[PDB]
Amino acid sequence: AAAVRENALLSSSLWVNVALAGIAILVFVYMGRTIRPGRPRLIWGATLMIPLVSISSYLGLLSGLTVGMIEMPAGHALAGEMVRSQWGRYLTWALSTPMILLALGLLADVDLGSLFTVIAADIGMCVTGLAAAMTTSALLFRWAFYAISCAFFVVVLSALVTDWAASASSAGTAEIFDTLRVLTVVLWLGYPIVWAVGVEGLALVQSVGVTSWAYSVLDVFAKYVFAFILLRWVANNERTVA
Amino acid sequence: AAAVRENALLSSSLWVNVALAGIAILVFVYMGRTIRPGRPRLIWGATLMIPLVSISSYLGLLSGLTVGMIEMPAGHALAGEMVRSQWGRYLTWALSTPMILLALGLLADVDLGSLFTVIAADIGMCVTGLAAAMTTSALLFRWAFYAISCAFFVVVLSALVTDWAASASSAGTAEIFDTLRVLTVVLWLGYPIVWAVGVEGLALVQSVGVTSWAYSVLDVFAKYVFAFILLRWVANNERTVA
Amino acid sequence: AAAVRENALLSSSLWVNVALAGIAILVFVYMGRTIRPGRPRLIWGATLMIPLVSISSYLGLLSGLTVGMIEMPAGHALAGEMVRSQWGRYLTWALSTPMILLALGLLADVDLGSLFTVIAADIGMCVTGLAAAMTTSALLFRWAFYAISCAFFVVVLSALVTDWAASASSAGTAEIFDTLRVLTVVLWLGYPIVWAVGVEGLALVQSVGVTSWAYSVLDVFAKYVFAFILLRWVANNERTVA
Numbered sequence: 243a244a245a246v247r248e249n250a251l252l253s254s255s256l257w258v259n260v261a262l263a264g265i266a267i268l269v270f271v272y273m274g275r276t277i278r279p280g281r282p283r284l285i286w287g288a289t290l291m292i293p294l295v296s297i298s299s300y301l302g303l304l305s306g307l308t309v310g311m312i313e314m315p316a317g318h319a320l321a322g323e324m325v326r327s328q329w330g331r332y333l334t335w336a337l338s339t340p341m342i343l344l345a346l347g348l349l350a351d352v353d354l355g356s357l358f359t360v361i362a363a364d365i366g367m368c369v370t371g372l373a374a375a376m377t378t379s380a381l382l383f384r385w386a387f388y389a390i391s392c393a394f395f396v397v398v399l400s401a402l403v404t405d406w407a408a409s410a411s412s413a414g415t416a417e418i419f420d421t422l423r424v425l426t427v428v429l430w431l432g433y434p435i436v437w438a439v440g441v442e443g444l445a446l447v448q449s450v451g452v453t454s455w456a457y458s459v460l461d462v463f464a465k466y467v468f469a470f471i472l473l474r475w476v477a478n479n480e481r482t483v484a
Numbered sequence: 485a486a487a488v489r490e491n492a493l494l495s496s497s498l499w500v501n502v503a504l505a506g507i508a509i510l511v512f513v514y515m516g517r518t519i520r521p522g523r524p525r526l527i528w529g530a531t532l533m534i535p536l537v538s539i540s541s542y543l544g545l546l547s548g549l550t551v552g553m554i555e556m557p558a559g560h561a562l563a564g565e566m567v568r569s570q571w572g573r574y575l576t577w578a579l580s581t582p583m584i585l586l587a588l589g590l591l592a593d594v595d596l597g598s599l600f601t602v603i604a605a606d607i608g609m610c611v612t613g614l615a616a617a618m619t620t621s622a623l624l625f626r627w628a629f630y631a632i633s634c635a636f637f638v639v640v641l642s643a644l645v646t647d648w649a650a651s652a653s654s655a656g657t658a659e660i661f662d663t664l665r666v667l668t669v670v671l672w673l674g675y676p677i678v679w680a681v682g683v684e685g686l687a688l689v690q691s692v693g694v695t696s697w698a699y700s701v702l703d704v705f706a707k708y709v710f711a712f713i714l715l716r717w718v719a720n721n722e723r724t725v726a
Numbered sequence: 727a728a729a730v731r732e733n734a735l736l737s738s739s740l741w742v743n744v745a746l747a748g749i750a751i752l753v754f755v756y757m758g759r760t761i762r763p764g765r766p767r768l769i770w771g772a773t774l775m776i777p778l779v780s781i782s783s784y785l786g787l788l789s790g791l792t793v794g795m796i797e798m799p800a801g802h803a804l805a806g807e808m809v810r811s812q813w814g815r816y817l818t819w820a821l822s823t824p825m826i827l828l829a830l831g832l833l834a835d836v837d838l839g840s841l842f843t844v845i846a847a848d849i850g851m852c853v854t855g856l857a858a859a860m861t862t863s864a865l866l867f868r869w870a871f872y873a874i875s876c877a878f879f880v881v882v883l884s885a886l887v888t889d890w891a892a893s894a895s896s897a898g899t900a901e902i903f904d905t906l907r908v909l910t911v912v913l914w915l916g917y918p919i920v921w922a923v924g925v926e927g928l929a930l931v932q933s934v935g936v937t938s939w940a941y942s943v944l945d946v947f948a949k950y951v952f953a954f955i956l957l958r959w960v961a962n963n964e965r966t967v968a
């Protein structure tokens with residue numbers, strides 16, 4: 243009907259990324275066999291962690307381990323209903339987005355003070371997003387947590403468009419950093435946009451299947467494709483980095 | 485009566501810090517507009533994270549997300565009763581007290597070996613404190629976990645009064661470190677004192693409202709005021725740090 | 727009978743490590759009184775954290791805090807039954823095995839890029855192992871999570887047998903690193919072997935008592951004895967390290 247249909251959107255959006263993460267793992271391992279030790283191999287190891295965390299996350303959601311029903315508060319578009327929350331996505335973003343930040347930070351050769359603060363701000367972003375999805379008592383707190391999460395996000399992007407970009411400029415990865423950083427701000431902006439537009443925020447799109455697929459498509463560009471671009475440039479520019 | 489009264493203590497002690505953390509965020513952002521890039525801006529970014537974690541924590545407790553009832557074991561002063569545990573406080577101390585340690589560690593220019601161990605010992609302190617509050621099976625374990633937590637605390641203070649202080653002495657922040665470190669050991673000693681004296685330990689003070697307010701007052705000095713002192717000295721001593 | 731017997735295996739395997747961890751703490755503190763500041767004292771502090779995390783973990787399992795019943799999926803050897811899962815072991819490995827990696831990384835003087843990736847891969851190993859034990863919906867996911875965990879394990883061992891070993895060779899701890907790294911790969915291989923052979927995997931050994939004792943014996947060599955060897959060599963080689 244539309245529950246046949248809704249359950250077919252959900253499972254396919256999970257199984258596709260279990261597949262592509264696994265392939266990405268296999269491709270990145272293959273690519274590491276051609277990379278010289280040093281700062282190259284160190285970026286490769288951090289990058290390989292991105293799809294390994296990702297496949298664990300989708301196995302988490304698929305196995306039911308990291309999914310639950312959350313009752314939506316009054317004034318929510320779906321007030322009084324139990325929607326299935328893919329809260330495992332927030333959990334695993336917490337370990338996967340620092341992996342990305344570690345790769346970008348190694349590439350740009352950022353200072354470690356900056357690295358810790360960004361990864362800390364990034365873990366803040368992820369966790370308050372989880373609080374936003376888990377909050378049932380009042381609609382106000384759901385968006386309060388959303389706004390606070392955006393504040394951490396703003397700290398993460400600010401450090402990239404300034405401090406880390408400056409560091410890549412004096413590390414000789416200035417150009418490749420520009421591309422990944424353009425790619426990071428555009429795709430990462432998609433997630434709070436999917437949150438607001440979709441079932442958990444405004445619920446202008448009410449399918450849990452659809453918003454799940456939106457996240458899954460974002461995961462394709464922000465994890466696997468992003469990672470693939472990084473490694474390819476690295477295997478082609480091993481002097482500039484080491 | 486006294487439940488009117490008890491619920492008025494609890495909500496005010498949460499809402500006050502949601503307010504002051506938010507103001508502190510606004511004030512620290514304002515203050516960052518005058519700070520030169522380098523080690524100054526890096527201390528500022530770490531410091532700004534302190535009240536952003538704090539407002540998320542109080543929103544967590546206020547929204548009911550991170551509060552539960554814990555049945556107290558036999559021999560507890562309130563044996564057989566369900567007290568409301570603000571366990572969200574332990575959770576968030578785990579992410580906020582490393583922020584403080586990061587700021588103090590950047591300021592003193594500590595070695596990274598020391599930084600990791602302290603933050604690890606500090607996360608140990610926080611987590612076993614949570615275990616102490618969550619344990620229901622026996623009073624012995626509650627204080628066992630308490631004592632172990634104090635052992636991590638002792639590791640954290642030892643590194644500050646020696647290794648990090650020595651590092652600040654050869655970093656030229658020797659004096660400002662002295663003040664913050666005096667301020668840190670005094671206020672941080674308050675938390676295990678509030679734990680023992682209040683409802684969760686000995687329960688010589690049995691109000692959950694009151695012990696919550698005690699923590700909230702400690703949070704005012706150990707997060708916002710502490711942070712405000714750091715930033716002010718930094719905006720006045722930007723050569724010494726960079 | 728055999729539940730008298732089974733509950734006697736479980737409690738003794740927990741209480742023995744609460745005892746030996748506590749003794750180990752006392753012995754390592756004593757040993758730190760003779761260690762010179764610098765890279766020596768920094769390895770000592772990281773090492774002391776190993777048994778302090780360990781005693782908290784066993785107090786967690788003993789107090790019932792971090793133990794639950796998991797219903798085993800169809801096709802499991804114990805399909806349809808509730809076995810007691812010592813999931814607290816996975817939780818605490820997550821904070822204790824980075825402590826070990828920190829000590830080995832300080833000793834070998836590894837690069838910080840390598841340190842973060844290994845500790846990240848190691849936390850991945852631990853967490854997906856927990857997912858493996860917690861998964862109830864299907865036997866496939868339990869071993870899927872197992873295989874993914876082994877992939878992180880493989881990343882951790884690879885970095886040790888190459889990158890960190892190379893770093894110890896140019897740090898002068900080349901020899902002591904060889905011994906600890908031989909000791910680490912052998913003992914760490916025991917844990918996924920106990921997982922597969924014991925109640926949670928294949929259940930060729932079905933006692934929860936017995937598999938718990940297997941883990942406890944592994945904890946004796948991989949935490950306390952390992953740590954004791956490190957400190958002894960350090961107190962005897964303080965020039966080579968500093």
Ligand SMILES: *C/C=C(C)/C=C/C=C(C)/C=C/C1=C(C)CCCC1(C)C
Nearest residue numbers: 371388391392395430433434437464
């Ligand atoms: C690979 C996964 C990535 C890069 C995920 C990024 C996720 C975010 C940038 C999430 C952002 C959110 C906000 C900024 C507001 C609150 C809701 C969130 C958590 C979706």
Ligand SMILES: *C/C=C(C)/C=C/C=C(C)/C=C/C1=C(C)CCCC1(C)C
Nearest residue numbers: 613630633634637672675676679706
């Ligand atoms: C901003 C929040 C801060 C600085 C919190 C500090 C918390 C502590 C120092 C907690 C200490 C505790 C012990 C030492 C014993 C067990 C109970 C605790 C967790 C309250």
Ligand SMILES: *C/C=C(C)/C=C/C=C(C)/C=C/C1=C(C)CCCC1(C)C
Nearest residue numbers: 855872875876879914917918921948
């Ligand atoms: C002190 C505790 C230590 C060193 C524990 C190490 C644990 C492991 C190496 C666990 C390995 C596992 C796998 C590789 C597969 C999945 C099951 C685990 C988590 C037992």
Ligand SMILES: CCCCCCCCO[C@@H]1O[C@H](CO)[C@@H](O)[C@H](O)[C@H]1O
Nearest residue numbers: 317318319320381385438443444445
């Ligand atoms: C991007 C942030 C804009 C939204 C900020 C908070 C909006 C208040 O909340 C929203 O109000 C609407 C009223 O029916 C509902 O449709 C939504 O489900 C609800 O989340």
Ligand SMILES: CCCCCCCCO[C@@H]1O[C@H](CO)[C@@H](O)[C@H](O)[C@H]1O
Nearest residue numbers: 559560561562623627680685686687
């Ligand atoms: C600062 C640590 C001192 C206390 C150590 C453990 C004390 C044992 O426990 C205490 O015993 C009392 C007996 O009624 C009770 O009032 C307390 O509620 C209980 O926690």
Ligand SMILES: CCCCCCCCO[C@@H]1O[C@H](CO)[C@@H](O)[C@H](O)[C@H]1O
Nearest residue numbers: 801802803804865869922927928929
């Ligand atoms: C080391 C990994 C080898 C096992 C891989 C997955 C094995 C499938 O699973 C196993 O099948 C058996 C059939 O009865 C059962 O005895 C086990 O309990 C079950 O876990």
Ligand SMILES: [Cl-]
Nearest residue numbers: 299334335338
């Ligand atoms: Cl993820």
Ligand SMILES: [Cl-]
Nearest residue numbers: 541576577580
């Ligand atoms: Cl906090």
Ligand SMILES: [Cl-]
Nearest residue numbers: 783818819822
């Ligand atoms: Cl452990």
